[PDB]
Design a protein around this ligand. Structure first.
Ligand SMILES: Cc1[nH]nc2c1[C@]1(C(C#N)=C(N)O2)c2cc(N3CCC(CC(=O)O)CC3)cc(F)c2CC1(C)C
Ligand SMILES: Cc1[nH]nc2c1[C@]1(C(C#N)=C(N)O2)c2cc(N3CCC(CC(=O)O)CC3)cc(F)c2CC1(C)C
Ligand SMILES: Cc1ncc(COP(=O)(O)O)c(CNCC(=O)O)c1O
Ligand SMILES: Cc1ncc(COP(=O)(O)O)c(CNCC(=O)O)c1O
Ligand SMILES: [Cl-]
Lengths: 442, 442
């Protein structure tokens, strides 16, 4: 009693929007630092009938039966996660059930501290994620500021984590958890100095490496596994897997954390795991460990470095004046334009990036920068020499944004009126589509 | 810089297990009441590259750009959902971002009541879900019992919701929310009487129709939309969509609930939506609204009715002595066996079902029943005449379980030793595999 007609036949409306989405992805210079492109195998997993199975619980301790093949999949994903990050299954455990990064963090935080528990994270404007306790004066924006008591440490004016500030805050606030690893931080992290501060105040060290996971696995950036109690990461960014998350916990430093984290994921928070996600993660984790993937990750940093260099050579200011990782934040103050304006300009030429706060920014509406990243285009074959072109297109968008603000005004409503039909933009879009459309596309 | 080799080539280890899972699904009488089989279309969506896009926020109010085709998918999904449950976009809104049922419930409850907020739901042992505030003496098992102040109302000895008890509890506890719609409740619900209790104490009416959604959409069972403030449902059970969830909210009854629910899903709880889920949901929701899908849903009930009947005629007791829906809970006390034992027996003959508490059960370990449901086999083409066969097999399993308990003992450890190699089970497995293996399989 089912219709087995293909997607194109059964739902033509939806199939066209998705064909379009596909065409837009193919013809874009994607610099969203948090995005990547999945290969066909990861998408086969995601489309696999294994998502039919309810398998609440954990492997060999399942509530239901018929989970023999599911257990094999889940255990393989756990094995390969521990492998990929070069930790021993005797010292480290991992939970592969969190449905996405925000869930993984709320779950992992609750395991450690509980309701009304105290946590410290980096402020949103400085590079922290919403799930690191974000709130504003007007409201508790994140559940992690409401279901927990949260405190937020800022970076200095130059855009670096100020560890003096982190200690001053940890001693007076006395949190049970200190979170590090970030959404828009362009530099590496001193986990040892975090570990040192946590040890002092008897807090857990929590490292969210979602943005830089590949660097950590491939031994290119600092390893928080040598110091952290918990490591969280999404699997869909630089790691290039499906949309899912992994919670890692150090058993030796905190015995009985396994039970706390596993029970927090289920049954505290989630219900049935999504086994298609688990399959897809397991698949990408095989690839993560190959020496080929280390090469891709190396190319990511080589590209980021060269993009940063080319932008500085065009008199564009970056926060921290560069990058240790896949990401760069442009400081646009010298050009007297917002990140929101540049974003719109860039979307009009099929350049995908996001607006982003800088240190001097008081508020998150009208931020003074954009964030760019190399994982997506590095996945599409672009190399160091190709970054001069991306730098050139971004320079041209900035210039056009300045001209348009002059002609149509500073109000965003007015500015946007300038965008459609603009001869130069139409021209620049053409240049972008021609270069992007011909690149390899998984 | 990617490997585009197919799944079978890139990851043979994993591809074999998934081949095995496929064959296990194919060769099973699936009576897990919460399970179903997705078609190829829905799985195409889940495999679609649309999961590459970060698209935090809501349509036309997105934080990032390049979400033109994503906006269309999300708005199509919301439209198709409102249609499917026969509600006007003027009166009702829906959020299509919740990643699964548990997440949708925590998010919706948070929107309505907030941290420390008061909620009432049905106890797990009576048919309630974990996310309806479940706790026991030892611990607060669900986050819903910890981040909220929860109280639990029970069914009477015959297994029915006792509204007298729901009233008495509501007037002394005075919750902000009362939850109805359940995980193992085999009868329909008097939402009106819930609405009149809620109104009396000024609580919201929350209906979680995950198990019975298709019945609600096709007008076969009571419609909580006529009375409820919030309706939650998973999309993966009787509705036969992907793993995801929908939050419906009545704007007329509660102006400003829209913003409350929308900000609860993001940015309070989740981050980037999973657009492959959203597409997949959109795809299934079109099918849901066809008259062919109403015929399927009717067949679910016709089969459930026939299965109930056939089990009664073999002297097997059902909680409430029957069913108004897709599910039956067998009371096994007369045979002096546990649902835990029967489940293992059924798992050995490729019969998938789950252990389940009955009203007399004190504690959730060692429950005295099993739950069975018809949506999966109804999807696989089975009709009323086929239910006698399923009833025969389950009767034979109960018998075998009694005999094995006699021979090897009441302890589950010993009991399981009796399963492997058992000539009768092998015979019965064979009969199961032959009938199931040849049924239509999406
Ligand atoms: C969404 C999100 N989650 N975690 C994040 C973001 C970011 C961000 C920045 N900067 C950082 N550091 O991390 C972000 C956050 C926000 N806000 C502005 C304030 C808003 C509060 C409200 O009015 O409800 C909460 C979300 C806007 C952006 F454009 C961005 C870009 C982003 C995606 C990188
Ligand atoms: C998992 C889950 N979530 N929501 C549910 C269940 C069910 C269940 C029942 N009955 C009901 N009504 O709804 C259920 C729940 C449980 N427990 C046993 C006790 C446990 C507490 C602890 O020791 O941590 C909480 C979950 C065991 C089962 F076999 C089942 C079957 C089920 C899947 C239908
Ligand atoms: C450090 C960090 N942690 C967790 C998450 C959460 O991932 P989910 O969206 O899968 O919940 C993000 C994504 N942040 C959004 C971005 O940079 O685009 C992140 O940057
Ligand atoms: C009423 C109800 N609500 C929510 C959920 C949660 O769905 P997720 O698993 O997608 O979180 C369930 C599933 N309960 C498990 C079962 O009936 O088998 C449910 O029965
Ligand atoms: Cl998915």
């Amino acid at each position: 009693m089912f219709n087995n007609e293909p997607l194109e036949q059964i739902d033509k409306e939806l199939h066209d929007i998705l064909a379009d989405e596909e065409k837009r992805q193919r013809e874009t210079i994607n610099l969203i630092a948090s995005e990547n492109l999945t290969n066909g195998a990861v998408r086969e997993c995601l489309g696999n009938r294994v998502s039919n199975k309810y398998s609440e619980g954990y492997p060999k301790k399942r509530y239901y039966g018929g989970n023999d093949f599911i257990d094999k999949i889940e255990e393989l994903c756990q094995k390969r996660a521990l492998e990929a990050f070069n930790v021993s299954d005797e010292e480290w455990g991992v939970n592969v059930q969190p449905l996405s990064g925000s869930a993984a963090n709320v779950q992992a935080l609750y395991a450690l501290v509980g309701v009304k528990g105290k946590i410290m994270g980096m402020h949103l404007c400085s590079g922290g994620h919403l799930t690191h306790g974000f709130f504003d004066e007007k409201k508790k924006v994140s559940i992690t500021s409401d279901m927990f008591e949260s405190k937020l440490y800022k970076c200095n004016s130059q855009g670096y984590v100020d560890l003096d500030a982190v200690r001053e805050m940890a001693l007076s606030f006395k949190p049970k958890v200190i979170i590090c690893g970030y959404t828009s931080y362009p530099r590496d992290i001193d986990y040892q100095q975090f570990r040192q501060i946590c040890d002092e105040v008897n807090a857990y060290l929590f490292a969210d490496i979602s943005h830089i996971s590949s660097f950590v696995a491939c031994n290119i950036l600092n390893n928080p596994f040598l110091h952290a109690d918990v490591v969280t990461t999404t699997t869909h960014k630089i790691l290039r897997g499906p949309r899912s998350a992994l919670i890692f916990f150090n058993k030796k430093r905190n015995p009985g954390i396994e039970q706390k984290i596993n029970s927090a994921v289920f049954p505290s928070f989630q219900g049935g795991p999504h086994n298609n996600k688990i399959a897809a993660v397991a698949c990408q984790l095989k690839e993560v460990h190959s020496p080929a993937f280390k090469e891709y990750t190396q190319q990511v940093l080589l590209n980021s470095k060269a993009l940063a260099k080319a932008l500085i050579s065009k008199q564009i200011d970056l926060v921290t004046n560069g990058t240790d990782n896949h990401l760069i934040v442009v400081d646009l103050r010298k050009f007297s334009i917002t990140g929101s304006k540049l974003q719109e300009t860039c979307n009009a030429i099929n350049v995908s990036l996001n607006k982003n706060t800088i240190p001097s920014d008081v508020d998150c509406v009208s931020p003074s920068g954009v964030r760019i990243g190399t994982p997506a285009m590095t996945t599409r074959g672009a190399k160091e020499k190709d970054m001069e072109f991306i730098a050139d297109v971004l320079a041209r968008a900035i210039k056009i944004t300045v001209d348009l603000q002059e002609q149509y005004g500073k109000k965003l409503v007015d500015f946007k009126k300038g965008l459609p039909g603009n001869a130069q933009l139409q021209q620049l879009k053409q240049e972008v589509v021609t270069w992007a459309g011909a690149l390899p596309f998984p």
